[PDB]
Amino acid sequence: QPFQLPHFYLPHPARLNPHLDEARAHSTTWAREMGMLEGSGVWEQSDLEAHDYGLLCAYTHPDCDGPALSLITDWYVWVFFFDDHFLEKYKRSQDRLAGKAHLDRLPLFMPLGMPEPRNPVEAGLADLWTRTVPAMSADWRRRFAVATEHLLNESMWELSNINEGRVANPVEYIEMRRKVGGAPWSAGLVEYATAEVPAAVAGTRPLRVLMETFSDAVHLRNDLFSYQREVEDEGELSNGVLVLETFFGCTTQEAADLVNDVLTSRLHQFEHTAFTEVPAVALEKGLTPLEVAAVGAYTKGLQDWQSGGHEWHMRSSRYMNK
Numbered sequence: 663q664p665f666q667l668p669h670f671y672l673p674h675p676a677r678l679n680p681h682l683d684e685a686r687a688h689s690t691t692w693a694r695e696m697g698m699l700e701g702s703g704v705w706e707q708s709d710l711e712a713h714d715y716g717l718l719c720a721y722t723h724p725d726c727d728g729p730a731l732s733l734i735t736d737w738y739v740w741v742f743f744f745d746d747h748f749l750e751k752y753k754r755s756q757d758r759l760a761g762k763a764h765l766d767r768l769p770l771f772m773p774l775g776m777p778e779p780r781n782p783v784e785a786g787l788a789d790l791w792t793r794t795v796p797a798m799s800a801d802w803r804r805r806f807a808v809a810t811e812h813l814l815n816e817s818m819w820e821l822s823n824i825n826e827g828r829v830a831n832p833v834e835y836i837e838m839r840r841k842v843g844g845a846p847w848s849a850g851l852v853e854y855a856t857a858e859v860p861a862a863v864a865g866t867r868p869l870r871v872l873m874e875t876f877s878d879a880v881h882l883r884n885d886l887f888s889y890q891r892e893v894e895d896e897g898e899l900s901n902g903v904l905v906l907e908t909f910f911g912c913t914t915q916e917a918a919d920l921v922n923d924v925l926t927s928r929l930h931q932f933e934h935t936a937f938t939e940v941p942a943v944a945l946e947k948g949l950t951p952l953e954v955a956a957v958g959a960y961t962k963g964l965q966d967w968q969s970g971g972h973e974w975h976m977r978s979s980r981y982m983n984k
């Protein structure tokens with residue numbers, strides 16, 4: 663173990679969806695149906711169960727019913743399969759050209775007909791997209807497809823950095839995980855689980871800031887938990903602890919300690935944003951009682967996502983949690 667986990671700022675206790683065991687059973691079955699287990703070259707069933715994405719989603723989406731949790735869990739099974747698949751098939755061989763082609767096919771499985779799927783990533787996305795889109799607005803649809811594409815562009819950017827040996831500097835790292843990282847995608851599914859953000863406030867600064875603080879915080883937390891795997895097994899350079907470490911030339915523990923202080927700070931700004939800036943713009947735009955409740959449902963969702971996410975990271979076999 664390369665460093666000891668720091669003292670985390672954890673103000674709000676996590677809650678756990680009672681449909682957890684339902685989500686587990688369904689998603690493991692769905693994974694095999696998509697071809698993500700034996701024969702994938704990526705996961706065996708034992709891997710998927712040890713990662714425990716049912717537990718992740720039950721922690722991060724505590725209030726939705728059994729069917730919603732099952733769909734969300736499949737989404738996360740898919741997003742992590744895509745991550746480990748891309749690593750195993752393209753990153754470890756630094757196959758930038760084949761990676762590009764792989765990624766270029768995936769938008770064909772998010773129509774705003776579809777081709778036949780040739781791999782589990784394509785198969786999973788096709789399935790999820792058809793199951794999810796009918797329940798949401800046409801506007802959520804366009805935003806969610808964009809968010810999913812950003813995730814895809816992220817893998818490319820990361821691979822190119824690995825291939826050229828270039829670690830991003832601290833501002834570059836943050837801005838890149840903001841622009842193409844998976845926080846808007848996660849927040850996209852929080853809306854599915856809670857309510858879509860009223861368009862009257864969706865593009866305003868306080869909701870933008872709310873997303874910035876949410877994004878920074880979730881990535882920095884994961885960086886702390888996955889540094890060991892990423893640095894001494896994967897060769898992944900997209901990690902905040904590694905970014906500070908190379909920039910300052912400090913010890914691993916020193917960088918993790920500062921990363922965590924940055925994390926606590928982002929969490930502070932989230933709380934302030936959620937409590938003050940967002941309610942203010944809700945008044946300024948004259949949202950109805952119903953619209954205000956949707957906003958509150960969503961921001962509350964982000965809070966529970968973060969608290970649950972930490973409890974998951976402390977348990978999943980993906981991470982440095984002893």
Ligand SMILES: NCCCC(O)(P(=O)(O)O)P(=O)(O)O
Binds near residue numbers: 745980
């Ligand atoms: N799509 C899921 C993202 C997975 C990660 O969180 P992990 O540390 O678990 O590998 P990332 O690769 O972004 O660091």
Ligand SMILES: [Mg+2]
Binds near residue numbers: 745
């Ligand atoms: Mg990744």
Ligand SMILES: [Mg+2]
Binds near residue numbers: 745746
């Ligand atoms: Mg990863």
Ligand SMILES: [Mg+2]
Binds near residue numbers: 884885888892
């Ligand atoms: Mg990580």
